[PDB]
Amino acid sequence: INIVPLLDVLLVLLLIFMATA
Amino acid sequence: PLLDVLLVLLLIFMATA
Amino acid sequence: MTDMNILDLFLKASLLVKLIMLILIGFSIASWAIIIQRTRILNAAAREAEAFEDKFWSGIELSRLYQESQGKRDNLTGSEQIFYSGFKEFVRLHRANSHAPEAVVEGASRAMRISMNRELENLETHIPFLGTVGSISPYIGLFGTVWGIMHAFIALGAVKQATLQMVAPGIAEALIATAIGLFAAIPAVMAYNRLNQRVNKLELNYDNFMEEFTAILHRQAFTVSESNKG
Amino acid sequence: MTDMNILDLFLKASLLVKLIMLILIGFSIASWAIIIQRTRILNAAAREAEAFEDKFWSGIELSRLYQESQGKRDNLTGSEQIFYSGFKEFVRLHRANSHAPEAVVEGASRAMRISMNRELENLETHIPFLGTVGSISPYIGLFGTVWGIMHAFIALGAVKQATLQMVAPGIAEALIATAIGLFAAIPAVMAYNRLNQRVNKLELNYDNFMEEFTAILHRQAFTVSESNKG
Amino acid sequence: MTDMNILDLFLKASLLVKLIMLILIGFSIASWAIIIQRTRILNAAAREAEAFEDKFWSGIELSRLYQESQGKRDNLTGSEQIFYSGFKEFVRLHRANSHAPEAVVEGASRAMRISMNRELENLETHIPFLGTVGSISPYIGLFGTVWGIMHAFIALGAVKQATLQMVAPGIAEALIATAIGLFAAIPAVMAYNRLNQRVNKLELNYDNFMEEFTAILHRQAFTVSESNKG
Amino acid sequence: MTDMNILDLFLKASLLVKLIMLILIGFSIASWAIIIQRTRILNAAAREAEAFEDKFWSGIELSRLYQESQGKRDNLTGSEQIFYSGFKEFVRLHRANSHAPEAVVEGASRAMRISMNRELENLETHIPFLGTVGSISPYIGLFGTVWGIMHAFIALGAVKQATLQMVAPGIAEALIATAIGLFAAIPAVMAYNRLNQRVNKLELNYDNFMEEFTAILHRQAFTVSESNKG
Amino acid sequence: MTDMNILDLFLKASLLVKLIMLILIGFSIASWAIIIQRTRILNAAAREAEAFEDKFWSGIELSRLYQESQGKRDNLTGSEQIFYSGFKEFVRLHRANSHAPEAVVEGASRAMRISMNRELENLETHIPFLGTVGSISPYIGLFGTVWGIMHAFIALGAVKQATLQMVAPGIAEALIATAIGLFAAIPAVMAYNRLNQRVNKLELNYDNFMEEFTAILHRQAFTVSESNKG
């Protein structure tokens, strides 16, 4: 199981999530 | 890792509005 | 108060996301099915192989043993199947090339290798699917999760005014997707490792048997050749 | 004022969350039990192997030592059991088929390797259980954390305006599964690797005993067989 | 309703990101074509190897089979190629240096190794690229996604009143990159493991053949050499 | 203006949080000192091993180099230690067991292997510490960071008008432990790898030299024993 | 619109941030350089070993071959060095113990193994650096992101009015750190696997040749032993 690419995204998600305000 | 952002999603969900 | 049901989240899922979740569900299910079936078959094969190895090493006569196996030959496996075929090849090469115990023994061993590789295949079936599924699924889940997220930001940018409320559903769905992928993945990978280990164990045992039968066949062929001349 | 007790979440955790905690904690207990038992067993196995090697390489003749071992053959482990099995099989094979000392060596060696395999099997019992539990438990915690995640999202879905008031119970509720999973995982992998290392040590020691004893048996067989023909 | 559909976003994609996307799409197509061509090659090779195995094991005369192979020598493949190489080498060396059967045998084994490895180059060809893709692709997608997302995200923070619109479309697009990367990775990795499996199978088949043929050639050399001296 | 510096919030870490941070700091110091000491130790051992091998493979007499190693016996490591012990055991068993040059040299070589095991164990000392610390200290920091943030969002849950500043301080105070743990882990893993690679280099040094010396000692015992019977 | 090039964020980045970034940049540069030089080395070695074996198998005189290689002993590489070492040690051993072709053969085999392993290390230099790099860099991207979000929280908590603007630099730092980590990693993984494969291929080649030359030399020693008694 390679895991590296997994969550390095999600952090990104919550930056636009923050941009929602 | 999987667990670590379970929080981050919940947290920034809880705090965004 | 309303029970917090994932169903409301499901029916809002896009075409692609729902389809991918279905892919993951099916892969997980078949993972379980293969794990169970292969596990049972492997355990039983190992036990029968142990019993037959001990029976052969019980000092039992080779020809007696071969007659006894040949009686029920229609159901041979693993050690005993290889024994049967190899004994057959030893018999025939000794009948044709008794003058060459070493050459006869070599053809014996080759018949044995043939049968063994056959059994290794017969037993390994579907396992590479296990490894494939375990190794591939997390990427699938991440893909679906990313897709949902993209549609979420599609919902967000197309609105002049920002807000958290408009985006939560997409996030929830996509994260569920990643989770599902991981759920499917972990069992597959664990099973893949375990099964390959036990398979290697069997393989080592079989190779050991092949060489041991080979050398015993060397002694048998040489002795049968010489004592019938003096 | 009310004390900020950690159980304030556990009691308010959703039934699924408490189920996840219970299962993970059960695996935590099992991890501890098997870890400790294997720890004691390996320490004792190392000490017994030390004890038997110390007397075996003390110069004592192997016949008397074999009779001593037979006194409790019911009760043999590790190097001592390898010793007795090799002694017995070597004597019987040498007396039965002295004409082929190499055959004596080979049969006895395979018997010794058999005993060593069995002892290694004894030492490794349930160790893979520890490894698998350590690898897997964080994901069992994942299941519950995810269900809490979705409960929290549907919780916020109740109010028209989103805000940092509503779902924090649901959030800290969700995370309990993850925490209990990590609680289950840390010692399990810790000890899995540690006992893996110690068992590698033990396996190496037993193999070296097998090698020296096999060579001793080979020399005894060859010298005795050659002398018988003088 | 803005027709904010994925195709157009890709059309108006930023410079470096669009370059990355084209790179990945090419990776995808090339993976596709490599899979297809190599699948054809391996299927046909499996078929041809199958038939050649079946015809060889038939007890057919070696010289006759060699002549039939020779008739199309210009287009030999697989076990046919190995057989031709070894057999021709054997005949030549036998007719030149019949006095050293071991030497001729060794040369023949050399020749079969040479042709066989050549064949494995022919077959394995480009697979390591499939591995390379299934290895890098996720990270390339990450990288492009990150670069573009950074651009938009920090473009946000240079205005007094942070507004969602200046970013959401941009990040929605940028994520397309990682999506594509994983979409390419999936079939890539599936095909990788599949093809490597089949290749190992071929390898074992060929090696077993090489050994059996080696035994046969040893036997023929020795039998003919001793017969001519009677 | 309050000095909320990294050190400030670290000191103002809550009891569990401050304790976790301190534990991580202790791990860091321990790993750093271990790494430097073991690194210089590896450099010294490699220097000594290479110099001694250069001296041995120059044709120096076995007895002369042997007593020269006896001279610093109390300060021998690695290859020099192994050679000294090997020739000592070989000579001693030969004088006691000259009748079996093979048995003598095999006993001496196994004693050499035992010394090699002991010195390798000395080398690995403090190394598993580094590996597992690097593995786990992330867990120690992150667990506490996680719980603190949970409690922080529980607290800000009571606010009608949510603002991050009611949680940003707590979130940072939590994340400090994670950051320090990982910062200390990085070098742990790097040094673990580098020093383990050196360790395997030295281990191969020792196995190869042991095999060379064992063969040379077999030759020496054979020559001396055969001459003794002239 | 601000010409918001990444260089600006880097230059505005904090000191530790810039240090981390440059650390990654250096790792990447060295990674590419290692891959390049090592690849050229291995290509040259592959070609020269291939040609050497081709010419050697051609049936040319072994002694003439050793003369010619000794013509440039200063510049032996791979197969050539192994041949020279084996043949020289063979010459010496036969001059000592032609009576024991088995002993002489084993001694030459040890010599060739030594030469081979030395060559293999000479080839493998810095590969483990690539392994370590591909192992660590993403962890670096992580910790960098963590420090970035840390400074982000410091800034966000110090303003009377919460504004997402203050954290923008921190997360920008996180993004740049992670991007550099990925960029350094890609080549690492790719080339690391590639190079391990190639070197193992060469290792197979050399082992095979070693065995072949071993049998040839055993035969040649026996032939010379028989001829000397003529």
Numbering used by the authors:
A (entry chain F): 16 to 36
B (entry chain G): 20 to 36
C (entry chain C), D (entry chain B), E (entry chain D), F (entry chain A), G (entry chain E): 1 to 230
Text from the published report:
The energy-dependent step in Tol function is removal of TolB from its complex with Pal in the OM, which is catalysed by TolA in the IM and energised by PMF-coupled TolQR. The Tol and Ton motors are related to the archetypal stator unit of the bacterial flagellum, MotAB.
TolQR isolated in 0.01% lauryl maltose neopentyl glycol (LMNG; w/v) yielded higher order complexes in native-PAGE, within the range of 150 to 250 kDa, consistent with a TolQ pentamer (110 kDa). The complex adopts a 5:2 stoichiometry similar to ExbBD and MotAB. The TPH dimer sits in the periplasmic entrance to the pentameric pore in a manner that is largely superimposable across all three assemblies. Comparison of the cytoplasmic face reveals that the TolQ pentamer adopts an expanded conformation relative to ExbB. An outward (into membrane) rotation of transmembrane helix 2 (T2), transmembrane helix 3 (T3), accessory helix 3 (A3), and accessory helix 4 (A4) generates this expanded pore conformation. The buried surface area between ExbB monomers ranged from 1,469 to 2,152 Å2, whereas TolQ exhibits weaker packing with buried surface area from 862 to 1,223 Å2.
